[PDB]
Amino acid sequence: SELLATYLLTEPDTEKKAEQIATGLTVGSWTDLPLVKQEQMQKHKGRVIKVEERAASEKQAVITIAYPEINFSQDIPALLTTVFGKLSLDGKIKLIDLHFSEAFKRALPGPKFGVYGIRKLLGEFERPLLMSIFKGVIGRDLSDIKEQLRQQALGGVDLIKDDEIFFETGLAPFETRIAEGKQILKETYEQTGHKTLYAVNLTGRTADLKDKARRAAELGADALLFNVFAYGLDVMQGLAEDPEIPVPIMAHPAVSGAFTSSPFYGFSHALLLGKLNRYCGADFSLFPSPYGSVALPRADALAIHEECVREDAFNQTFAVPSAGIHPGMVPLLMRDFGIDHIINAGGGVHGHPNGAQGGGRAFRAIIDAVLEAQPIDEKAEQCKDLKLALDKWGK
Amino acid sequence: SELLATYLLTEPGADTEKKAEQIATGLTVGSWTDLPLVKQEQMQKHKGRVIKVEERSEKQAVITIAYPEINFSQDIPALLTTVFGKLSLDGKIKLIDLHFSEAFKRALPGPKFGVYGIRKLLGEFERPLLMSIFKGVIGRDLSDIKEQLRQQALGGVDLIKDDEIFFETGLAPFETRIAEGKQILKETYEQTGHKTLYAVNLTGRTADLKDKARRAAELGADALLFNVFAYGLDVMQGLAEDPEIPVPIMAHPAVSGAFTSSPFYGFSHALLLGKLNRYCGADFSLFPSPYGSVALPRADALAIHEECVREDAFNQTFAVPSAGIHPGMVPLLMRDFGIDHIINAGGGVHGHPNGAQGGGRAFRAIIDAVLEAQPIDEKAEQCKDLKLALDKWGKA
């Protein structure tokens, strides 16, 4: 078995580097090894698979190296430490992709529910989903939070997620949100016939996650919002592998920008937010859409989606483009991602003239228009909420 | 109480103060222009406050913001998500420093042993320490380990560490290594009066770390090499807080380059490898020296040491410069890091003409020459091992 690692080296004889990383980063200086040690450490020796040279102003090269799987235990910490530990500090080198062996994949859980599971839960298979976020949580009482939830639900969103900074501060406890949120969503459902899921933020010390997530499960929580890059992919994996946590996991990119934003260092967005999040149990994976306030280059956005949906020995992950999306962007979002993605309208929904209800309906209306091939102008005339949103945000 | 976060903004816009204010309110209370001014009062205490704004290739600004601690729980995951969660994705913003309240510090463990503790453990207080690593293991047996420990120990090495890439192997299992390495080191001590510690790699699933580390403690492990950035600062913190793991933790910087190498994104080296490691329990903190193949800007290397050593509510972390170091670099190293740091001679001792013992000897000889103001040319002539290392990698 072998694990392939692809890297982008931005400047620094790249073939030389490729070899050194293949041997030095798997066996170290090999020409100094005693023949005997050299003749048994051969099975641990990595090998250069390819060295291509990539469209910018700097001279960049793409390198793929095979690492004998016997070189590290079957877990993400061991893997990253082996293929991108010491190496991550070696000049301009970025880990772009990883191709796992069937055996390693056997040690990874993948999402418990994935696209199929979430859609099954919502009874919606013919349309990309709509997600909404609380306008704000900090310093707001339970009463405030509750109404925001109602308004988002009545708006028609399929999912409502907590703000990633919603911690256990005593204003609206974790277990209480799950309880009240569940009730409110049953009430909105009774009123509209539309099902909504509430993704509750899972926070606190790493050692307490397990019991908190199980508690969420027995309380009937719909989904668990988890900031992986604040706890580690392995911790998320532990959650996804727990049968006592039969709840979907929504991976938020909080902090991930720290090691993906750079075009020369860290990780590619597709690998981190796409492949690894998926393999480690993310049922949802949020990322900046290519068109919002904060954005990702289309290429990167598309790649994350492809990683989330590609056929693999894991359930597919729901890609969720986010950050400042507005209704006029849905046609774009739907052109790129197809129907298997979730449009995260974020908290902007509350800024709609008609409230969160209007923001949600503005979004639901245009995604329908796109699916029905109905001229948006025409839809805008039948749904004032959509027209208002388009006049305010444009296009 | 609140905590101060300092960011380095690159191309933050025309009005940096406005930008600073958008970040301050945006990452805290947001727009409450809809409550209105009856609750706005009760929320003023949740409002982020801009403390300072300094402006300066492209336009850059350094901004410090104060976040009320009531906005988040007393843990690192919550803290980093609050100050650098979504912001880390918003263009070129880098978190270069964090100033915790005494209330938060009370909630952190800091190093269990620290400089004092490990030095007390070795009985060495007037000399920077020497560290080395195995040559060709990670597929090696216990005998090669017991022999490499013996050679490096006898060479005067103060501490030996596994490769951070040495995981569960049938030949040399975690517990057995600890047990065997401990015996051989007791032996070298008996015959030289020189003490030496063995840092063993602590790996596996996060959920198994605690019991595994508690097991190392019972076995007499000298220190646990931990790849913190492969698990998370919060995990190391959990280890450092556990009194049933009365064992020093050695933080390896693996994977951290992905968060710090960029000059426009991520975290600063000093904050991640320095303050955060220390605050979360790291007794040692490794990082590339400014002089080897794999280098780190002198300024950042020094900054890390500064964070590790500055008087604080916690014990001091032993700074450990490492990447490809040789004896000739010692003078520079001692000039930069003084007495309280460890020189990670990596394989700069194994690749020595007289083996790891000669290499370790070469290092001990020159750090002594520096301390006693003895010329490297004179000390060399006295120590055949030093002469050889110098004539091989370059003189002082």
The Cα-based distances of A107 to A75, A83, A103 in angstroms read 8, 18, 7
Q: State whether A184 and A327 are in the same domain.
A: yes
Structural contact between residues A119 and A31, judged by C-beta atoms closer than 8 angstroms: no
- Of the candidates B18, B52, B86, B120, the residue annotated as catalytic is B86
Question: Would you state the torsion angle of the CA atoms of residues A364, A365, A368, A369, taken in this order, to the nearest 10 degrees?
Answer: -150
- Three-state secondary structure string covering chain A: CEEEEEEEECCCCHHHHHHHHHHHCCCCCCCCCCHHHHCCHHHHCCEEEEEECCCCCCCCEEEEEEEEHHHCCCCHHHHHHHHHCHHHHCCCEEEEEEECCHHHHHCCCCCCCHHHHHHHHHCCCCCCEEEEECCCCCCCCHHHHHHHHHHHHHCCCCEEECCCCCCCCCCCCHHHHHHHHHHHHHHHHHHHCCCCEEEEECCCCHHHHHHHHHHHHHCCCCEEEECHHHCCHHHHHHHHHCCCCCCCEEECCCCHHHHCCCCCCEECHHHHHHHHHHHCCCCEEEECCCCCCCCCCHHHHHHHHHHHHCCCCCCCCEEEECCCCCHHHHHHHHHHHCCCEEEECHHHHHHCCCHHHHHHHHHHHHHHHHHCCCCHHHHHHHCHHHHHHHHHHCC
Q: Among the three residues A70, A89, A108, which one is the final residue of a domain in this structure?
A: A108
Structural contact between residues A121 and A150, judged by C-beta atoms closer than 8 angstroms: no
Full residue range of the structural domain in which residue A204 is found:
109-395
Instruction: Report strand pairing: A93-99 vs A2-9.
Output: antiparallel
| Candidates A165, A258, A266; nearest CB to B82 | A165
Q: State whether B177 and B240 are in the same domain.
A: yes
Separation between Cα atoms, residue A293 and residue A9, nearest integer Å: 29
Residues of B in contact with A89 (CB under 8 A): 253, 256-257, 261, 288, 294, 296, 323
| Candidates B81, B90, B168; nearest CB to A165 | B81
Structural contact between residues A225 and A251, judged by C-beta atoms closer than 8 angstroms: no
Are residues A77 and B227, on separate chains, in Cβ contact within 8 Å? yes
Q: State whether A209 and A145 are in the same domain.
A: yes
To the nearest whole Å, the CA of A231 is away from the closest chain B CA by 6
Which among B309, B357, B268 is positioned nearest to B115, based on CA atoms? B309
Separation between Cα atoms, residue A92 and residue A258, nearest integer Å: 15
Name the amino acid, one letter, at B223: A
Q: How many CB atoms lie within 10 A of CB A52?
A: 11
Rg (CA), chain A: 23
Structural contact between residues A345 and A130, judged by C-beta atoms closer than 8 angstroms: yes
Handedness of CA B346, B351, B355, B360 (dihedral sign): negative
Q: State whether B267 and B348 are in the same domain.
A: yes
Asked about B86 being catalytic, the answer comes back as yes
Q: State whether A81 and A143 are in the same domain.
A: no
The residues near A40 (Cβ < 8 Å, ≥ 6 apart) are B139
Give the pair of three-digit tokens for residue B139. 């597929």
User: In the Cβ-directed half-sphere of B34, how many Cα atoms lie within 13 Å?
Assistant: 12
Separation between Cα atoms, residue A174 and residue A96, nearest integer Å: 36
Q: Among the three residues A70, A91, A108, which one is the final residue of a domain in this structure?
A: A108
Separation between Cα atoms, residue B78 and residue B108, nearest integer Å: 13
Residues of A in contact with B261 (CB under 8 A): 88-89, 91-92, 262, 264-266
Residue given tokens 């510690």 in the structure block: B197
Q: State whether B81 and B218 are in the same domain.
A: no
Are residues B81 and A37, on separate chains, in Cβ contact within 8 Å? no
| Candidates B71, B77, B204; nearest CB to A75 | B204
User: Residue B283, annotated ligand binder?
Assistant: no
Separation between Cα atoms, residue A318 and residue A129, nearest integer Å: 9
Are residues B257 and A87, on separate chains, in Cβ contact within 8 Å? yes
Separation between Cα atoms, residue B198 and residue B193, nearest integer Å: 16
Separation between Cα atoms, residue A301 and residue A319, nearest integer Å: 9
Rg (CA), chain B: 23
Q: State whether A347 and A391 are in the same domain.
A: yes
Q: State whether A124 and A205 are in the same domain.
A: yes
Name the amino acid, one letter, at B249: I
Method: X-ray
Which among B195, B191, B213, B192 is positioned nearest to B204, based on CA atoms? B213
Are residues B88 and A27, on separate chains, in Cβ contact within 8 Å? no
Are residues A266 and B254, on separate chains, in Cβ contact within 8 Å? no
Separation between Cα atoms, residue A194 and residue A123, nearest integer Å: 10
Q: State whether B163 and B239 are in the same domain.
A: yes
Structural contact between residues B366 and B330, judged by C-beta atoms closer than 8 angstroms: yes
Give the pair of three-digit tokens for residue A170. 């005593």
Q: Residue B36: is the preceding peptide bond cis (ω within 30°)?
A: yes
Which among A288, A290, A296, A377 is positioned nearest to A332, based on CA atoms? A290
Q: State whether B104 and B118 are in the same domain.
A: no
The Cα-based distances of B69 to A98, A167, A231, B52, B129 in angstroms read 39, 11, 20, 19, 39
Nearest CA in chain A to B256: A88
Give the pair of three-digit tokens for residue B174. 């975690």
Which of B49, B90, B261 is the best residue to mutate to test the A interface, defined by the most A CB atoms within 10 Å of its own CB?
Answer: B261
Are residues A89 and B207, on separate chains, in Cβ contact within 8 Å? no
Are residues B86 and A135, on separate chains, in Cβ contact within 8 Å? no
The residues near B65 (Cβ < 8 Å, ≥ 6 apart) are B4, B5, B7, B20, B23, B24, B27, B48, B49, B50, B51, B83
Residues of A in contact with B232 (CB under 8 A): 206, 230-232, 235
- Number of domains composing chain B: 2
Structural contact between residues B354 and B361, judged by C-beta atoms closer than 8 angstroms: yes
Q: Among the three residues A108, A124, A154, which one is the final residue of a domain in this structure?
A: A108
Dihedrals phi, psi of A382, to nearest 5 degrees: -95, -25
Phi-psi region of B193 (alpha: psi -120 to 50; beta: other; left: phi over 0): left
Instruction: Report strand pairing: A61-68 vs A2-9.
Output: antiparallel
Length of chain B measured in residues? 396
Structural contact between residues B93 and B263, judged by C-beta atoms closer than 8 angstroms: no
Nearest CA in chain A to B89: A257
Q: State whether B33 and B65 are in the same domain.
A: yes
Domain of B380: which CATH number? 3.20.20.110
Q: How many CB atoms lie within 10 A of CB A55?
A: 4
Instruction: Report strand pairing: A61-68 vs A47-52.
Output: antiparallel
Dihedrals phi, psi of A43, to nearest 5 degrees: -70, -15
Q: To what resolution in angstroms was this structure determined?
A: 2.3
Separation between Cα atoms, residue B112 and residue A382, nearest integer Å: 67
Strands, sheet with A318-321, edge to edge from the N-terminal-most edge strand: A318-321, A284-287, A249-251, A223-226, A197-201, A159-161, A129-133, A342-344
The Cα-based distances of B243 to A80, A83, A128, B118, B226 in angstroms read 29, 33, 50, 17, 17
Structural contact between residues B299 and A291, judged by C-beta atoms closer than 8 angstroms: no
Residues of B in contact with A107 (CB under 8 A): none
Dihedrals phi, psi of A294, to nearest 5 degrees: -105, 135
Q: State whether B168 and B225 are in the same domain.
A: yes
| Candidates B85, B136, B267; nearest CB to A28 | B136
The Cα-based distances of B215 to A149, B137, B212, B244 in angstroms read 47, 23, 5, 9
Give the pair of three-digit tokens for residue A191. 């009123």
Domain of B18: which CATH number? 3.30.70.150
